[PDB]
């Protein structure tokens, strides 16, 4: 026997309130006042419903109004022993929800100082010395946030033509291919691990304030784009056909090392550089490519076909660490959010569709899964700093630079009827690849 509902959201579960998905019930839609009711249910505690709600709630509720209605949930009026038994765990759930909130989603409070003020006021209001001794934990979490050994030692850093410290002489054919793939895998794994779910939920990276709300995601995407462009620029600006096949071969070797290190982001970097307009038509250059590397590149390219069928397969099969490809996740998230209704309607009443939010949360979780295990590879500071300050475009813009690349391709390999002119050599050092199998 709870209150009269004129002092609570105690209205019993109805079809105008909640609908579940055909041993805890999976909520599929419901009025917000009952959504939080199930979030702080007395019958049972649902930790995954908490983890999913607090990650995907801003799309139908602002942090302030959530704090307000959870405070409204914590303040229960009495109509006895039965009812105190009921009141205890509801308040417990509310306080553990606040704990999870400040723990895993503290940004909501860094962007709203008054939200933190309300939270601190609210936790300073709980009474019952036992409960308050338990509340000190949330207090300490707030105060905190306001202020790996592998089996064998990682393999040696490999060098080729550039001796360590000679950063001036760093380039694609100067550094060892294996180490190029390694340092790129490290940088891209760090970029992939830095992306937090607050930058994907709500499709916020596609809206006008994407620079503000998705800085790490855009940083990683720009890195991969920049490297694809650098690959094309190395191929096409190498006007001598001999050196140009050298460049293409080293790039295919780096693709091999990517395939091995399970760095699929870098694999796609390379195969995009190959599928570009300026590079895809260099018939006279791919002619001289060994067949064993042609099959490597073909196996890589087949990963994206039929909507990345083989990529999804291989990613689900391999053992991490790995740098998966992000674009697929982003496409799926955007299409779920903009392809499913924001609310369901029943008996003329609007209920927040939560299933959609749960699916987006699943995609977020699969992103976070691969962010755990790091790479057992030693970083070289200066090679990393070489690939961090690479600017193929320079001061040019997208169209200007794309056209420069395509026109350079036309220059080094004119269309059929015209004969292939030969160019002088660019690189005054040997072009033999030092293999792609390590030293020892």
């Amino acid at each position: 026997l709870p209150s009269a509902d004129v002092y609570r959201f105690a209205e019993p579960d109805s079809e105008e309130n909640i609908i579940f998905e055909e041993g805890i019930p999976i909520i599929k839609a419901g009025t917000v006042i009952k959504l939080i009711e199930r979030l702080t249910y007395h019958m049972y505690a649902d930790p995954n419903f908490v983890r999913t709600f607090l990650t995907t709630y801003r799309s139908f509720c602002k942090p302030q109004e959530l704090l307000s209605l959870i405070i409204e949930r914590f303040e229960i009026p009495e109509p006895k022993r039965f009812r105190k038994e009921y009141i205890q765990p509801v308040q417990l759930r509310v306080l553990n929800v606040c704990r999870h909130w400040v723990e895993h989603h503290f940004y909501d409070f860094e962007r709203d100082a008054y939200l933190l003020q309300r939270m601190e006021e609210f936790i300073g209001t709980v009474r019952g010395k036992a409960m308050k001794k338990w509340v000190e934990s949330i207090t300490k979490i707030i105060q905190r946030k306001k202020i790996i050994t592998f089996q064998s030692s990682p393999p040696t850093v490999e060098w080729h033509i550039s001796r360590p410290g000679h950063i001036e002489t760093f380039d694609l054919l100067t550094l060892h291919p294996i180490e190029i793939a390694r340092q790129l895998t490290l940088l891209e794994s760090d970029l992939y691990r830095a992306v937090q779910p607050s930058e994907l939920v709500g499709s916020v990276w596609t809206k006008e304030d994407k620079e503000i709300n998705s800085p790490n995601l855009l940083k990683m995407i720009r890195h991969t784009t920049n490297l694809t462009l650098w690959f094309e620029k190395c191929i096409v600006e190498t006007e001598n056909l001999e050196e140009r096949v050298a460049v293409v071969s080293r790039i295919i070797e780096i693709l091999q090392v990517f395939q091995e290190l399970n760095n699929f982001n870098g694999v796609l970097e390379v195969v995009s550089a190959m599928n570009s307009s300026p590079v895809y038509r260099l018939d006279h250059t791919f002619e001289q490519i060994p067949s064993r590397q042609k099959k490597i590149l073909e196996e890589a390219h087949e990963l994206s076909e039929d909507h990345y069928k083989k990529y999804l397969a291989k990613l689900r099969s391999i053992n991490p660490p790995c740098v998966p490809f992000f674009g697929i996740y982003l496409t799926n998230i955007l299409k779920t959010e903009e392809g499913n209704p924001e609310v369901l309607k029943r008996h003329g009443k609007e209920l927040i569709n939560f299933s959609k939010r749960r699916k987006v949360a699943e995609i977020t979780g699969e992103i976070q899964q691969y962010q755990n295990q790091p790479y057992c590879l030693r970083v070289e500071s200066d090679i990393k700093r070489f690939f961090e300050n690479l600017n193929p475009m320079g001061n040019s813009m997208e169209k200007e630079f794309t056209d420069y690349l395509f026109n350079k391709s036309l220059e080094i390999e004119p269309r059929n009827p015209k004969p292939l002119p030969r160019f002088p050599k660019k690189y005054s050092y040997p072009l033999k690849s030092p293999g792609v199998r390590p030293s020892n």
């Binding site: 002619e287 490519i289 067949s291 099959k295 073909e298």
Partner: peptide, 7 residues
């Protein structure tokens, strides 16, 4: 298709 032919 593709310059990376195969046979």
């Amino acid at each position: 298709x593709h310059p990376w032919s195969v046979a």
